[PDB]
Design an enzyme around this catalytic site. Structure first.
Site, PDB file in Angstrom:
ATOM      1  N   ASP A 147       0.909  -0.978  -0.093  1.00  0.00           N
ATOM      2  CA  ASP A 147      -0.164  -0.162  -0.166  1.00  0.00           C
ATOM      3  C   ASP A 147       0.900   1.378  -0.129  1.00  0.00           C
ATOM      4  O   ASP A 147       0.652   2.236   0.822  1.00  0.00           O
ATOM      5  CB  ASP A 147      -0.844  -0.024   1.180  1.00  0.00           C
ATOM      6  CG  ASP A 147      -2.000   1.008   1.032  1.00  0.00           C
ATOM      7  OD1 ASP A 147      -2.095   1.722   0.135  1.00  0.00           O
ATOM      8  OD2 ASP A 147      -2.729   1.192   2.227  1.00  0.00           O
ATOM      9  N   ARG A 151      -0.481   8.926   1.032  1.00  0.00           N
ATOM     10  CA  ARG A 151      -1.207   9.124   2.486  1.00  0.00           C
ATOM     11  C   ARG A 151      -0.445   8.452   3.325  1.00  0.00           C
ATOM     12  O   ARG A 151      -0.815   8.546   4.670  1.00  0.00           O
ATOM     13  CB  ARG A 151      -2.750   8.657   2.157  1.00  0.00           C
ATOM     14  CG  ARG A 151      -2.763   7.172   2.018  1.00  0.00           C
ATOM     15  CD  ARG A 151      -4.180   6.740   1.366  1.00  0.00           C
ATOM     16  NE  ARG A 151      -4.230   5.532   0.885  1.00  0.00           N
ATOM     17  CZ  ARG A 151      -4.206   5.013  -0.335  1.00  0.00           C
ATOM     18  NH1 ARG A 151      -3.923   5.874  -1.132  1.00  0.00           N
ATOM     19  NH2 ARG A 151      -3.970   3.683  -0.630  1.00  0.00           N
ATOM     20  N   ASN A 152       0.326   7.409   3.178  1.00  0.00           N
ATOM     21  CA  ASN A 152       0.938   6.736   3.925  1.00  0.00           C
ATOM     22  C   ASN A 152       2.601   6.904   4.420  1.00  0.00           C
ATOM     23  O   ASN A 152       3.241   6.098   5.115  1.00  0.00           O
ATOM     24  CB  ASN A 152       0.902   4.953   3.671  1.00  0.00           C
ATOM     25  CG  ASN A 152      -0.514   4.770   3.591  1.00  0.00           C
ATOM     26  OD1 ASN A 152      -1.384   4.772   4.577  1.00  0.00           O
ATOM     27  ND2 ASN A 152      -0.852   3.684   2.743  1.00  0.00           N
ATOM     28  N   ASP A 168       2.717   3.761   7.529  1.00  0.00           N
ATOM     29  CA  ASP A 168       1.458   3.167   7.904  1.00  0.00           C
ATOM     30  C   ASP A 168       1.716   1.727   7.144  1.00  0.00           C
ATOM     31  O   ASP A 168       2.014   1.585   6.106  1.00  0.00           O
ATOM     32  CB  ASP A 168       0.199   3.813   7.342  1.00  0.00           C
ATOM     33  CG  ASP A 168      -1.119   2.920   7.619  1.00  0.00           C
ATOM     34  OD1 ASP A 168      -1.236   2.018   7.319  1.00  0.00           O
ATOM     35  OD2 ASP A 168      -1.681   3.502   8.655  1.00  0.00           O
TER      36      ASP A 168
HETATM   37  C1  LIG Z   1      -0.461   6.731  12.749  1.00  0.00           C
HETATM   38  C2  LIG Z   1      -0.108   8.359  12.128  1.00  0.00           C
HETATM   39  O1  LIG Z   1       1.180   8.966  12.853  1.00  0.00           O
HETATM   40  C3  LIG Z   1       1.574  10.155  12.492  1.00  0.00           C
HETATM   41  C4  LIG Z   1       1.115  11.298  12.201  1.00  0.00           C
HETATM   42  C5  LIG Z   1       1.640  12.617  12.370  1.00  0.00           C
HETATM   43  C6  LIG Z   1       0.730  13.635  11.819  1.00  0.00           C
HETATM   44  C7  LIG Z   1      -0.410  14.205  11.190  1.00  0.00           C
HETATM   45  N1  LIG Z   1      -0.686  15.137  11.036  1.00  0.00           N
HETATM   46  N2  LIG Z   1       0.275  16.056  11.650  1.00  0.00           N
HETATM   47  C8  LIG Z   1       0.252  17.464  11.597  1.00  0.00           C
HETATM   48  C9  LIG Z   1       0.428  18.061  13.043  1.00  0.00           C
HETATM   49  C10 LIG Z   1       0.386  19.476  13.066  1.00  0.00           C
HETATM   50  N3  LIG Z   1       1.354  20.154  12.016  1.00  0.00           N
HETATM   51  C11 LIG Z   1       1.169  19.577  10.526  1.00  0.00           C
HETATM   52  C12 LIG Z   1       0.992  17.999  10.382  1.00  0.00           C
HETATM   53  C13 LIG Z   1       1.287  15.094  12.229  1.00  0.00           C
HETATM   54  C14 LIG Z   1       2.888  12.604  12.684  1.00  0.00           C
HETATM   55  N4  LIG Z   1       3.586  11.336  13.030  1.00  0.00           N
HETATM   56  C15 LIG Z   1       2.924  10.203  13.022  1.00  0.00           C
HETATM   57  N5  LIG Z   1       3.802   9.112  13.433  1.00  0.00           N
HETATM   58  C16 LIG Z   1      -0.324   8.348  10.690  1.00  0.00           C
HETATM   59  C17 LIG Z   1      -1.166   9.089  10.302  1.00  0.00           C
HETATM   60 CL1  LIG Z   1      -2.446  10.196  10.781  1.00  0.00          CL
HETATM   61  C18 LIG Z   1      -1.209   9.452   8.722  1.00  0.00           C
HETATM   62  C19 LIG Z   1      -0.181   8.798   7.769  1.00  0.00           C
HETATM   63  C20 LIG Z   1       0.806   7.887   8.071  1.00  0.00           C
HETATM   64  F1  LIG Z   1       1.425   7.278   7.532  1.00  0.00           F
HETATM   65  C21 LIG Z   1       0.678   7.676   9.842  1.00  0.00           C
HETATM   66 CL2  LIG Z   1       1.906   6.670  10.478  1.00  0.00          CL
END
Ligand SMILES: C[C@@H](Oc1cc(-c2cnn(C3CCNCC3)c2)cnc1N)c1c(Cl)ccc(F)c1Cl
Length: 293
Positions: A147, A151-152, A168
């Site tokens: 995948d 988005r991942n 992801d």
């Molecule tokens: C599970 C989740 O984890 C995270 C999200 C985020 C994230 C999502 N959105 N933001 C915003 C925070 C405020 N500033 C802009 C980015 C940070 C950062 N690190 C992560 N490990 C996630 C998300 Cl939500 C989307 C795609 C991914 F591949 C993953 Cl692995």
């Protein structure tokens, strides 16, 4: 608890590093899907939550994902800080990527009449390089992501020092232990969506589509086509046209990733070489990105 095998080693959920709930603080929501928060442990983390209303299958699936991520060791794969499983709701703790997901970043960072040099072609190539490096790591440890898509992927930060990482692994976890309309068919090669065959060449195809996402600056693949139309389009030999302003050397990588036969597609070592050559070519990296008005 289930066992997972990667590289030469075999692991168990029991091997997941437990973080005591009391050391974890939730600072804000990060646009939930389960829910995701920014957190502190002082260590800044992303917290993935398991809804309590979920059942038993989902619970094991949830931890399986932490186990899978925990066993990787590579700069372009998000790190798992650990888990908090001895309290409800269950938490998974991940490396916090301040730049957020790659698709949103691209959409929100498209050059504008006010910020025309917000992003350049070289920034895009480096994101593509980063992810290709993560994919090569997966390929040579015989792991199929299944995948790969914008988005991942995640970015460490908004600005010039940014590093892209694969974030992801829910699809890989699923096939490891569902419906038609939830399959990412726009990222899948024919043998994948026709026969359910998955190989490292499966990911090569998907990476080609991601390339297109990257150089379109975040457009949905096959704009204005539904999944069923893409399925019939691709099966028929149809392929996407170049994103706007896309240099030929970059597009050429996409079209090699989309060869109909898996054995005709490059492995990620080859894709990396070709991406690096693009970073060397002034006619590529001096190309202006389009601006939306
Ligand atoms: C599970 C989740 O984890 C995270 C999200 C985020 C994230 C999502 N959105 N933001 C915003 C925070 C405020 N500033 C802009 C980015 C940070 C950062 N690190 C992560 N490990 C996630 C998300 Cl939500 C989307 C795609 C991914 F591949 C993953 Cl692995």
């Amino acid at each position: 608890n289930p066992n997972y095998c990667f590289a030469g080693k075999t692991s168990s959920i029991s091997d997941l590093k437990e973080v005591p709930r009391k050391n974890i603080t939730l600072i804000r929501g990060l646009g939930h899907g389960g829910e995701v928060y920014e957190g502190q442990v002082p260590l800044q983390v992303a917290v993935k939550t398991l809804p309590e209303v979920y059942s038993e299958q989902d619970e094991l699936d949830f931890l399986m994902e932490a186990l899978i991520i925990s066993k990787f060791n590579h700069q372009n794969i998000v790190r798992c800080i650990g888990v908090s499983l001895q309290s409800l709701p269950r938490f998974i703790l991940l490396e916090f990527m301040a730049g957020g997901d790659l698709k949103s970043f691209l959409r929100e960072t498209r050059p504008r009449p006010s910020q025309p040099s917000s992003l350049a072609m070289l920034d895009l190539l480096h994101v593509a390089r980063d992810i290709a490096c993560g994919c090569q790591y997966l390929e040579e440890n015989h792991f199929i992501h299944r995948d790969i898509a914008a988005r991942n992927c995640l970015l460490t930060c908004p600005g010039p020092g940014r590093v892209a990482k694969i974030g992801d692994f829910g699809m890989a976890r699923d096939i490891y232990r569902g419906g038609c309309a939830m399959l990412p068919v726009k990222w899948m090669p024919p043998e994948a969506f026709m026969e359910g065959i998955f190989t490292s060449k499966t990911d090569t195809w998907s990476f080609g589509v991601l390339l297109w996402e990257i150089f379109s600056l975040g457009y949905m693949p096959y704009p204005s086509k539904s999944n069923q139309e893409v399925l019939e389009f691709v099966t028929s030999g149809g392929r996407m046209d170049p994103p706007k302003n896309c240099p030929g050397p970059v597009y050429r990588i996409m079209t090699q990733c989309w060869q109909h036969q898996p054995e005709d597609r490059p492995n990620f070592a080859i894709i990396l070489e070709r991406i690096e050559y693009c970073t060397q070519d002034p006619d590529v990296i001096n190309t202006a990105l389009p601006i939306e008005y």
